[PDB]
Amino acid sequence: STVEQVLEYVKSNNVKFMRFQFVDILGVPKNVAFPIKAGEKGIEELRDVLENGLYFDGSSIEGFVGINESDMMLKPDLSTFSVLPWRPSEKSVARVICDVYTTKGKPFEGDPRGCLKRVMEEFKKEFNGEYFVGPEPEFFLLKKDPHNPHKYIPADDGGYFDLEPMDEAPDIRRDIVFALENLGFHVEASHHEVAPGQHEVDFKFDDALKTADSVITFKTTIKTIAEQHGLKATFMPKPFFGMNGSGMHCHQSIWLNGEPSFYDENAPYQLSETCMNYVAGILKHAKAIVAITNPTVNSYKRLVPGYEAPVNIAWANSNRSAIIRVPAARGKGTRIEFRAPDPSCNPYLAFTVMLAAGLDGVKNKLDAPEPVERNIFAMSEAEKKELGIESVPANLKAALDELENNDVLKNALGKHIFESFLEIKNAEWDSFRTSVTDWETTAYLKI
Amino acid sequence: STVEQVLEYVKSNNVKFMRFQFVDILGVPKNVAFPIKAGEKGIEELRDVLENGLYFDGSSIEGFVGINESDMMLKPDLSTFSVLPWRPSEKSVARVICDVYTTKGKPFEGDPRGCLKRVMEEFKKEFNGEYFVGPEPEFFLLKKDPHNPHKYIPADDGGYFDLEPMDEAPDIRRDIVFALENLGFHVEASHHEVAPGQHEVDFKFDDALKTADSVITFKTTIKTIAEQHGLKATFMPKPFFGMNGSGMHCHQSIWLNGEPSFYDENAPYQLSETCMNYVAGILKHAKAIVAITNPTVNSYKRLVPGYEAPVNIAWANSNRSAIIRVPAARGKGTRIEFRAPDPSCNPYLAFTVMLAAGLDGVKNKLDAPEPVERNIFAMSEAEKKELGIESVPANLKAALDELENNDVLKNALGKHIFESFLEIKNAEWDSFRTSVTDWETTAYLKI
Amino acid sequence: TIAEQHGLKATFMPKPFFGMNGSGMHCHQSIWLNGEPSFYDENAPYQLSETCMNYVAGILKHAKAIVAITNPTVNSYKRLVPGYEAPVNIAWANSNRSAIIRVPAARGKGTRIEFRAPDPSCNPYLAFTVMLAAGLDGVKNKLDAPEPVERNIFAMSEAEKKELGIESVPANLKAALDELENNDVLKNALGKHIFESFLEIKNAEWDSFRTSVTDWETTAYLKI
Ligand SMILES: Nc1ncnc2c1ncn2[C@@H]1O[C@H](COP(=O)(O)OP(=O)(O)OP(=O)(O)O)[C@@H](O)[C@H]1O
Ligand SMILES: Nc1ncnc2c1ncn2[C@@H]1O[C@H](COP(=O)(O)OP(=O)(O)OP(=O)(O)O)[C@@H](O)[C@H]1O
Ligand SMILES: O=C(O)CCC(=O)C(=O)O
Ligand SMILES: O=C(O)CCC(=O)C(=O)O
Ligand SMILES: [Mg+2]
């Protein structure tokens, strides 16, 4: 939208506050609220901030700048304008997502959003291509343990596609869908997921930048709506041992010159050569991609080699036992599902590395291996070794070491994001590996 | 006629009470309520009190007069007229900020407000200058510890620029902004600050006297609105060990003959000679300025030499590790940020000493040192010693001893305020230094 | 250990409770040369020898630095607190408990000086070292002791003490460490290793105290 359209909506819908939003290196949303004054004076002041942006302290944001070079700017992207449904209707609250700039008026090298914009701009200039993503960020709804109020348990005992009363969340999922529609999402479906208290609310795919903006907005919405219902929502990959973790499978496709390039009516599986080259790129860099798409210690309690998880580096058709599933849908619906990611990732960075890795396959015309039509979880380790089916790294540190040795992902992320992420995550790993866990006390106090 | 405008507002908006307000030497607001009677008789009784003022006992106000010379007067400044938003709408409550006078009709020498008026009047008479200040008084929102209802803890676990639900204060910050707008403030921005439960609500800079009035009104507004939400707000500089303290950074600039004299398009850093002379004055008197801008024992738990704090007596551009930061903004936005102050200061006295010190630099054309573009917190003590970077005093008593030996600040404050402040603060220091603290019981009971 | 056996806890903390006396460790001391009580002199004023006066003069000269060692905690300066009734006034007196040194009435082999500033948080080996090295600085150089103060020093005004030359010991641990750091007699007595380790340990202890947020501050300032 244009500055005029934004001011006009604010003017006629009594918007009182404008959130200027962005994300830190870990994908945590950040914002400052600008109060809109009454009259022409207020609209002119808003026009100035919307066009010229505002300053903030970059040294108080994770992965940004140091204290001695800390002044930074936010430049609003006006096409991201939305009204917050959870906030009041009278004297309402709108938001605008921003790109981080330096004081010199240049895009910040450490901005995750600008990082995704730049790889998308390069993809459009080099191939006239568009990168489309449909992510499915699952979550748990939690309530306090009646036996210990300091602990959280799943909000119900339901399972996949269950009906009420076993599924206790229709009212919560209902309000979430209404909120996402008011924020401009095209919601597709909602249902109880496999684990107790786990849920899914699907929204239509879009270009990687809009989709990344929606993943950030989506997580805030589920969390604030769950609070309104006296519950707590979590996007933690594996909150509970013994039940499913939450993934964020990323359905993705590239469209060259406005066409669904992954579809080929006369090819095997009706999948194009470009689709196979892209799949080959993702499988080649899968071990390093997971440092970014699965960036927490807990991510590897769901993405756990040796078990039933999206860890096996192979692709397959309508088969949920490989790291890539190719859904049965064809035509414009032809796409690949990268199953490894979880909702703890920074979507801007996750989409950057998946595109960079897939385009490494397209640019070099890499050969994809044969699909694996068997249940990979039913194969023995030696049978997978013979077939060449490798696994992703088994923990955060092993994934960071893969990322550190991947030139394609280092170039896509750029020096600043790449080195800050490795530094932050190495300190996070050090904190975990030096702690004394409850598992250890249970296992070893008796010795 | 300003009085005619006040009386007409009262007549037509059903105003029932008029608070006559002022501050004691420590900046604590004080007021007496006058009930407005109906009709022309009531309006003339109110006219008489607005014009002629009213009496009070100055011996019951800290830093004022003794019991044997205790009758004093309050002379309303009618440009301060405002309606209290927290008070009822029907039969509303208005306020007027007053200047303290003696029974002989003379401005009281011990009045902090008159003290700032007088230095500003002298600055306008001598240079045709205006003194503009933009302060940022941070605060914590507190709730009772569920484990001990006698103790207070931060109201949430959020951090800098966090969004809800982690940031739990959008409703409180919203009501604060509305209350400040109703009080005539030009609010600029609001957001969660670095520490858990900490927040910031910025308002536009103005002349030092209006800004000092606004700081007093701002702190009452924050505190009353927080109480309405079942929380407690504190402007204590360092309420909790291990997390950020609350500062009140003072952005300031002097405008000679209506122009932003700190801006110089053709000078290094685009900062004028006057700006450099002013910075040199603040740096010269910084050790004594902090007795007034950081006047509590607790102020030196945030302003603590040897740690990451605004203690290093140096200036820098877009660098938050020095006692003065010069923001990147230029033109009319050209200003210096004195980072040492905290919201426990009396803004009338704080603005007086900062202007007096800056003008000592302007009047004598003092040379400012070179800016320090490095992170001062990364330098060793010997490296700072070589560069001539000194630190502010380490505690209240050390700061009082600096103030006692500063003729520029003693003359700006005047004998009465200066001697009363030193006497009160020496008794406050004596109280602290003779107490047995919890730190000591933990450290030494075992010996 | 005996208090624990009675179900109680004993503490040698200098000032555990505000509003009541602290615990001191007054050190009565005397030097005997060639087996004789050299502090006693039957025919001298107060029956105190010249050696006794030289020793008292040495302790009073170094009192400001001695307290870094004899009063080595933050809490020591809540008992040893200048401006109040405490053994802070650098003067000596006979049978008078308002000075830093009291000379008890006993004479003969009982002739000695009572250094009242120390508290039981000190390392006695280091406390006795600095007191002896300061007293012997007075003996070796035959320093002149000031006149005794027979008045109640707590009843004097600050200006009256300033005129009489009655100074106070440092007001806190850090001020005492800074006095010790500038005293060559005590640095030589302790030696480089003990001296530098003590200053390093105590500066970290001071930093810990000065960065903490105390209960006094919460009570005083949470309401602002
Ligand atoms: N051509 C495409 N490119 C990228 N994403 C697409 C495309 N077509 C659909 N999607 C997106 O794929 C996501 C998953 O859709 P959908 O749930 O219908 O498939 P699915 O096989 O049922 O996956 P799952 O079983 O994991 O839920 C949706 O966000 C959808 O918008
Ligand atoms: N020329 C000026 N003179 C004095 N004050 C000014 C001037 N221009 C702006 N200010 C004030 O300075 C204050 C700082 O506002 P602002 O937050 O925009 O700057 P900032 O450098 O980002 O501060 P911070 O990052 O510490 O919050 C505001 O109160 C503003 O009104
Ligand atoms: O339950 C859902 O998933 C969506 C909402 C709904 O169907 C309902 O309101 O019953
Ligand atoms: O949250 C703030 O800082 C101001 C209030 C606001 O933005 C809101 O109502 O959501
Ligand atoms: Mg689905």
Author numbering:
A (entry chain E), B (entry chain G): 2 to 448
C (entry chain L): 225 to 448
Which statements did the authors publish about this structure?
Glutamine synthetases (GS) catalyze the ATP-dependent ammonium assimilation, the initial step of nitrogen acquisition that must be under tight control to fit cellular needs. The dodecamer is organized as two stacked hexameric rings, and each polypeptide is organized into two parts, a shorter N-terminal domain (β-Grasp fold) and the remaining C-terminal domain. The active sites are located at the interface of the N- and C- terminal domains of the adjacent subunit in the hexameric ring. Two loops in the active center are critical for catalysis: the Glu-flap, involved in shielding the active site during catalysis and deprotonating the intermediate product, and the Asp-50’ loop, which binds and deprotonates ammonium.
